[model samples]
Target: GPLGSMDTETEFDRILLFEQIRQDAENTYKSNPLDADNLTRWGGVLLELSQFHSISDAKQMIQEAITKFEEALLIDPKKDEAVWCIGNAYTSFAFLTPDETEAKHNFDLATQFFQQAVDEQPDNTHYLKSLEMTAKAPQLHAEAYKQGLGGSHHHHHH
Candidate 1:
C-alpha cells in the first residue's frame, strides 16, 4: 500500500490498520511458506502490533514475531534485512520485558544486530539510525506504551 491516507477519518485506529496488515501478510506468508521476505515482513507487522499493548502486554505476539524473524534468518541468513528485522524484534522484547536485567540483555542483543547490519551493508542512515535508536528504546517504549493505553496526546504531521 502507498503511504498516503486518502480519507479524512479523524478517528483512525492504528491497531486496526496494523492488524489488517498482519492478516494480509500472514495470508501471503502462508501461501508461500518458503518466502523469507514474507516472513520478515510478518515479523515487522507483529512487532508494531505489540506496541499497542507492549511487551508484558503483547508478549505472545512479540514472541511469535521473534520466531518469524528467527525462521526468516535460518532460511536466508545472508539477507541483509534478516539481521535488522530480528534486531527490531529484539527491540520489541527490550520494549516489553519487565525484568531490568533481561531488558539490558535484550537491548544488548538489539544493538549487536544493528551494529552488525551497519557494518555489513551500511545504509547511509537507515541502518545507522537503527543503531542510534537502540539507546532510546526505553524512552520510546514508554511513549509508545503511553499511547498504547489511550492515545494520551495527539501526534500527526501528515
Candidate 2:
C-alpha cells in the first residue's frame, strides 16, 4: 500500500520501515536515473520521510523532494502525479515557514499547483480534495502564527 503500512507496534520498527522504503526508492531511482516515474517515487519517499525529522532536516528533505518532483515534471509533463507532488511539497514547506507572509505565499502556490492537477483530472477526488484543502490552509495557520508573533512584536499591518 503506502511503502508498507504503519502497522508496526514499535516506534523503532516504524522508523526502520521508513528507512527501508527510502532506501528502496533510492535504489529504484539509481536503477534508472532518467525515468520520470522513478524520480516521482523517490520524491514521494523523501516527502513522507521528512515528517519524522527535525525542522532543519525536514526542510532539506522537502527541498530535495521538490527538486526530484521538478525533475520528474521536466522529464515529462504528461502526468498529473508530478503536479500533485509539488503541491504537497509546497503545503509542507508552508507549514514549516515561520513568517506569515512567506507561509501564505507558499500556501497560495500550493493551491495553484493542486488546482492545476485537479483541473486535469476532474474525476480524481484526491486531486479535488487537495485543491480545496490547500486553498484554506493559509487561513488555518495564519491565526496561530499571528498570535505567536504578537507575543513579541507590535505594529499590526493594516
Candidate 3:
C-alpha cells in the first residue's frame, strides 16, 4: 500500500484517493510553487499511482515523481523526509526496469539517498531498514561496488 492509502478499502478506492490527492497537490504547487511540501505530496501521489497501475503505464509519471522529489530536496536539503521518499521511489523505479544496468544504477541511487537519511537521523528505523534492505540485496551487489570500506563486498564484476 502507498503512503496515502490508509483510508482506502479497495484497490479501486486507493487509486481514486491517490488521484484526488494528486490533483489537490498539483493545485497547491501551482498556487505556491515555492512550497516543497506540495511537491513532496505530488511525488507521493505519483508513486501511489504507479503502484495502482502498470509500471509501464506510469513510466513517465514515475520519472516526473523522481524529478519532483529531487526538486523538493533542492528546495530543502535538510528535509530527511525528502531523502526517505526519494530513496523509496528510486527502489520502486529500479524494480520497474528490466535492464540490469539501469536497475543497478537506480538501486545505488536509492542506497545513497537512504544513507543520507540514516546519517541525518540514526534513530529512524524506517531509513535504517530501507538502507539495509537495498544495501544487502544480492542482486544489486555487482553494481554496489562504489560502497567500500569493510562492508560486505559482494560482487560479480569480472
Candidate 4:
C-alpha cells in the first residue's frame, strides 16, 4: 500500500531515514569514489531504500544501486558481499517486470552473480542459499506465469 502500509507520519520518517543514509553515502562516495567497502555499503543502503519506496520510485534507485555494486566489484572482483548484493538486487529487479523474457534474463543475471558470490565464499550459508534461489527463480517465475499465480507485480523477493 503506502510505504509498507505505514501511516503518513511514519512514511515521512522512513523517507527521512532514506535521505539521511543516501546523503551519508553521497558524501562518502564523493570523498572516496573508488572505495570498494564504502561503495558496497552505499549500495546496500540504496537497496534497502528501494524496498521502502513505491516500484516506480524504486526503479531508478535500484539501477543506481546496481551500478554502485558493480563498481565495487570492479574495484575488488572477489568481494563476496558485493556479488551477493548484486544477486539480491537482480532478483528483485526480475520481479519488477511483467515480461517473462525480461524476468528470465534478470534471473539468469542474478544466478551468475550468486554463483560468483558462492565461489568467493564457499561456506557462507547465505551466499550458498542465495545461489540456489537465484538458480531457481527463472523456472519458478515461468511456472507461476504458466499457472497464472500472480498477474503483473508478484514474484519471489530473493
lDDT of 4: 0.77
Residues 1-158 of candidate 1 have per-residue lDDT tens digits of 53536586332366667777888778877787678788888878787778776556567887787778777787787756777877877776766775556765776777888877777778648777788887676666656455565744656776
By TM-score, is 2 or 4 better? 2
Clashing pairs in 3: none
Off by over 4 Å in 4: 1-18, 139-158
Q: Over 4 Å off in model 2, which ranges?
A: 1-8, 143-158
RMSD of 4: 6.6
- State how far residue 92 of model 2 sits from its true place (Å): 0.7
lDDT of every model, 2 decimals: 0.73, 0.75, 0.76, 0.77
1-158: candidate 3 lDDT, tens digit per residue: 35554664678877888888889888887786667788888887888898887878566677888788777887888877778778777777777775657876787888888878888997898888888878655365544433555566555898
Query: On residues 78-129, what C-alpha lDDT tens digit does candidate 2 reach at each position?
Result: 6587888887887777778877687778778878788778778868888877
Specify the poorest-scoring 10-residue window by lDDT in model 2. Answer: 1-10
Name the better of 2 and 4 by lDDT: 4
Model 3 lDDT at residue 27? 85
Q: Residue-wise lDDT of candidate 4 within 29-89, one digit each (tens)? A: 8888888888887877777777787766676777788899888888998888888888777
As a TM-score, model 1 comes out at 0.72
